[PDB]
Amino acid sequence: MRECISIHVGQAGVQIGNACWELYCLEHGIQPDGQMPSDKTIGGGDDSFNTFFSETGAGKHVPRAVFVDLEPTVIDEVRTGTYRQLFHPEQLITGKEDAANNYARGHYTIGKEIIDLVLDRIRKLADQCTGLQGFLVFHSFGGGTGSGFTSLLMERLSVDYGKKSKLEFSIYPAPQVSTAVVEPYNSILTTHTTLEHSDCAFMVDNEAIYDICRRNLDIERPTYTNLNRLISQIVSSITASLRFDGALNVDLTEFQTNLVPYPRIHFPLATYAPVISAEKAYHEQLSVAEITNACFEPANQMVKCDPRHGKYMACCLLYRGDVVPKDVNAAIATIKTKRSIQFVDWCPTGFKVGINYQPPTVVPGGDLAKVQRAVCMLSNTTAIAEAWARLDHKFDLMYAKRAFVHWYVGEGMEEGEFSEAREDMAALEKDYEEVGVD
Amino acid sequence: MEVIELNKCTSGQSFEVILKPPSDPSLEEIQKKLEAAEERRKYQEAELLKHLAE
Amino acid sequence: MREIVHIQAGQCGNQIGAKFWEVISDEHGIDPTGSYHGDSDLQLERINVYYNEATGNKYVPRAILVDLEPGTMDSVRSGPFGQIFRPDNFVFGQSGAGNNWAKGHYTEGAELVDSVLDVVRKESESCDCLQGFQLTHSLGGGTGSGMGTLLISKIREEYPDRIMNTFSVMPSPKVSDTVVEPYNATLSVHQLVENTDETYCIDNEALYDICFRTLKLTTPTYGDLNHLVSATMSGVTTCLRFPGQLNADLRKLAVNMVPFPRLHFFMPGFAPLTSRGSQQYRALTVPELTQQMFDSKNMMAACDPRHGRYLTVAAIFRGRMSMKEVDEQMLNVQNKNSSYFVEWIPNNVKTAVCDIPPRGLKMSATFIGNSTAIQELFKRISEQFTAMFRRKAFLHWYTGEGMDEMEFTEAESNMNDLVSEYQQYQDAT
Amino acid sequence: MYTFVVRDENSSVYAEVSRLLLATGQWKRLRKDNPRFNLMLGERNRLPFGRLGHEPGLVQLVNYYRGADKLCRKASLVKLIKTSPELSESCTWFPESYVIYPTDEREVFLAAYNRRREGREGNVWIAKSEGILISSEASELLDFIDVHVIQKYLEKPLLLEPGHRKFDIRSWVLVDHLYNIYLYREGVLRTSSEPYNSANFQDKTCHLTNHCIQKEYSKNYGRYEEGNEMFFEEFNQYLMDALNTTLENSILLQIKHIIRSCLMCIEPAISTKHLHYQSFQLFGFDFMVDEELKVWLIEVNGAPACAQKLYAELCQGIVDVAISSVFPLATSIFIKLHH
């Protein structure tokens, strides 16, 4: 067994981390004080959940997590909320003065003063690992901490652990729920610094999670709590193969093998189905076919785009609940004829499939209902370039006038980094268009 | 359309189905860049102090 | 980023300042004696941003009160909440400032400024993490205008990496103490465009019209004007004094409002509009609040938004209401009048909601606009300036204190450059 | 009150559409780069579908179906008809055609040409991208192209009288956001002025019926019908008087079959039924009726220009059907093709 360290950066990172770990605990039977009656082997184990938990002499299970925010409010909620005892205080790191939505304040100004402390705590966590796999890193694109300090951290992790895979969970900015006008700046900036340091990032446009929570959870104005519960449903679908018995995606290296042939194009599209209101009085349970079919409906994607006008490079289907290979192959056969699924010529048309018999776990008092079967499709499709297009466009709109640039220079950056990141994004957009369009 | 590498366990199954075959910087470098931004930032602060001195 | 240090300077400065401390003391459940007597714990969760906790578990405003004559400070101290303030923070001269910028910035005020800074320091050193400072003053007098800009300059020197925020009252002929106010205002605008992160332009002409045309007050007092200003100050600082999802601070506000560093002069707005006398009992619908808060007749800087374009907007709703209906109405405002928002700053209107309504209202909306229309204000002043200066009229009052006409040429020229910039982005792309 | 921008200033149809929108007093027009619009009348190339339908509190519509080029470029149309199963290889209404790249299907085009020359039946072809060259010899074509398309020439077309002249049929079809297929009732018929000559293939004007080409190299142009165009009333009345049949029976049934088949074939690829932005589009289908009264499909144009008489009526029909459907305000001219 090999271990995975989670790192949550900035407000969105820390909150989504909360949600995920709460979910992990419910799924694994781990109580809020760290006691897992399921675990007969006390003080240690060579089990699959040990990928994400370490065991104490007192039989306590503690996440391989680090929360880091340059500002104390959200990690103080963690330090006082329901899952106090779960975490070692040395793992919850705060500053006193945030990065004021300013990438340059997080990367240079405030980052330089806290990166060494963050890396020492991360190494004190790696030091309880027989064979560390790598890192899951949760952050936002739009935040000052979430972009600046995250990319500095990714740099340093590459240089200290050059042989460990690194996975990102990025929160793409959406105007309905975004805080700041310079989120398109930070986004581009941090992507340019992190592209060569990340092995597979899973973008999540807030806009999508928002419309899903409106249409399907029947929530009027969704909050961060709703978004984060749904996002953790997805994250757990994507990380279950690490914490459970199985032969698909059983280590971080398999993710870049099954989903990333070209290393620059490492942003897979996650599509999750079915999302059903816990308040639905009467609900008819969807078949394998109905949820596999829903996987190809853009209204169910973490990023609104149209895969019909891109080409696919790799597809993986992750089922939780009552599913059997027969019905998956049947559904696929039907869907290939009913849908438009074009692969790149240099890649076989087909699906790597994973079934876990344990149906989705839902938070008591959440908004999602229990279902008999659910699925998450990870697909590396070029159509995701749309989300960069939009982003790049907004970027240009401001930079054309050098608007807000002085806030970044004030912290020590150089206009050159703006242009150089933008050019990198231009390369990335063009690469997507090479691989995909005709 | 054929299955490949079916693996079964108590927790679930996993397999592949195929339909059609086909046709870094150092520590000193990042330390140097952080310190270059801190220098530019110090220079700006000094200019501000000079203008306020005047 | 918790503690803010408040400073009020001069007559007008201390009079709006004292009203603001009343309004928010009432909002936090502090009585004039200094003791909390409210109900919700929401009234203490961010009490530190403006109040030190003192002996006896009382609360003392983190406010320094500055004048060059004792008059207005004596009357503040004998006022309603006068006993709230720390007596050490009452820093006054005796000679006054004669509505003379030069007296305040160069001569009489220079005797006093080091004392004021000593108290500032004693107040900062008692802070956990100081966000920055905020000043309420006028630009037409002498203590407020001249010494406020002096203080701003020295505070920037002592704390160069902190936010400097002002509530600045622009002078109008419709409400005028002396003929030399355009000189003091032009000198102060020079300083402010140099040394302030965020300035709330509060035009006295606008408050006069609002009291007269709107509130139907046939002969408005300075108190009728200060009521508006204290209500608006309370409304802008709501996101700071109360628990929110945003966790907003001064620095983020400056980062997101100020696309270019000299263009940090904001139009405030209130809605609904309320007089001391009439206490109207009709709750407003959310569409009503939004139509009103974006109405020019609800803006405290006597500019016409339609004569320009909005660089950035920040809106603050207060009270129990539908956030869905809010977002709806706010998007409705943006899309029905898109020509008036700049296309090169995507999604440049941002909104905050607080669940607590202010005293007397159940629904409140407060508006913070960085519009290019503000150039109008600065042109207005500049015209009034030149009508005198082309004849060096009243300049002896300033030359007698050592100032040279070159300083006036420079200050005017800096303000005309400010006007140029605003105009430039008013027609960009 | 709805907002719309206009990102193609050279479009006759949507020019009259802008005009009629503004005249309702319920549409305002914005600058092109303003994202806060309801309706985009977008450009013909590199249209930014990646940016549509991401503006909260705005229902967005656009006048082009993303993916429709695969029916409206000549090479991609040919390849779609060949490969797509619903449009069988034996598709009886598409002239047998092959794609060629300059120095592929070169090999199979030659194989078919030779299989034909054994029977020695008419083997004229046409090369297509005004750049188009008809010939009976493979080598002249291949030296002219050195991406083009080589299509069997319909050697025996229906010839109008008096005059003895060929023609093509343009139909206009409106596909709205719900993927209803509306055929405009007033199709147009673009004729040759100077008579069809079987052997004189080098006079461009006898065989090519492009109105462009007619207003220039035509000896007389506008003799029989004004502007070289015959509308459906005259075409029907002539067909009744001369061949004892109807336009609707001998021609329009097949036209509706072809339109319905092409559009329902590409439907799953381009339908915006569940997307975050909607599309409508106006296509122009170019048909050719051989002397047996059989209809053939030549091309589909995605940006098409109407005829000067029908502009007002068709553009009012577009605003009614494709636009007022999404954005309501305060005997139809279209035939619904049922699928």
Ligand SMILES: Nc1nc2c(ncn2[C@@H]2O[C@H](COP(=O)(O)OP(=O)(O)OP(=O)(O)O)[C@@H](O)[C@H]2O)c(=O)[nH]1
């Ligand atoms: N889905 C989701 N998005 C969030 C959440 N919290 C913040 N965001 C998004 O993140 C962006 C701002 O990022 P933050 O995480 O608040 O920024 P930060 O990392 O705290 O950086 P600072 O500016 O220094 O506080 C906005 O676009 C928000 O939409 C969350 O809990 N869930």
Ligand SMILES: Nc1ncnc2c1ncn2[C@@H]1O[C@H](COP(=O)(O)OP(=O)(O)CP(=O)(O)O)[C@@H](O)[C@H]1O
């Ligand atoms: N295989 C064929 N058989 C008979 N006639 C043909 C033919 N190919 C072309 N033609 C004639 O020549 C003309 C062909 O031009 P075509 O329509 O292919 O170019 P075009 O200019 O219309 C491109 P577009 O689709 O934009 O209209 C038609 O008007 C038709 O009369």
Ligand SMILES: Nc1nc2c(ncn2[C@@H]2O[C@H](COP(=O)(O)OP(=O)(O)O)[C@@H](O)[C@H]2O)c(=O)[nH]1
């Ligand atoms: N809004 C408002 N303006 C005032 C008040 N008192 C004075 N002013 C304005 O301030 C200017 C004179 O400033 P003043 O405060 O007396 O200057 P000082 O010498 O700095 O105290 C004039 O434009 C007055 O209109 C007040 O209570 N409210």
Ligand SMILES: Cc1ccc(S(=O)(=O)Nc2cc(-c3ccc(C#N)s3)ccc2C)cc1
């Ligand atoms: C265009 C844009 C984008 C982002 C922001 S925000 O990040 O500054 N949030 C925010 C802050 C405030 C205040 C801070 C301190 C105050 C007192 N003094 S009010 C008020 C409203 C809002 C919405 C603002 C404007």
Ligand SMILES: [Ca+2]
């Ligand atoms: Ca164990």
Ligand SMILES: [Mg+2]
């Ligand atoms: Mg934060």
Ligand SMILES: [Mg+2]
């Ligand atoms: Mg006075």
Ligand SMILES: [Mg+2]
């Ligand atoms: Mg044509």
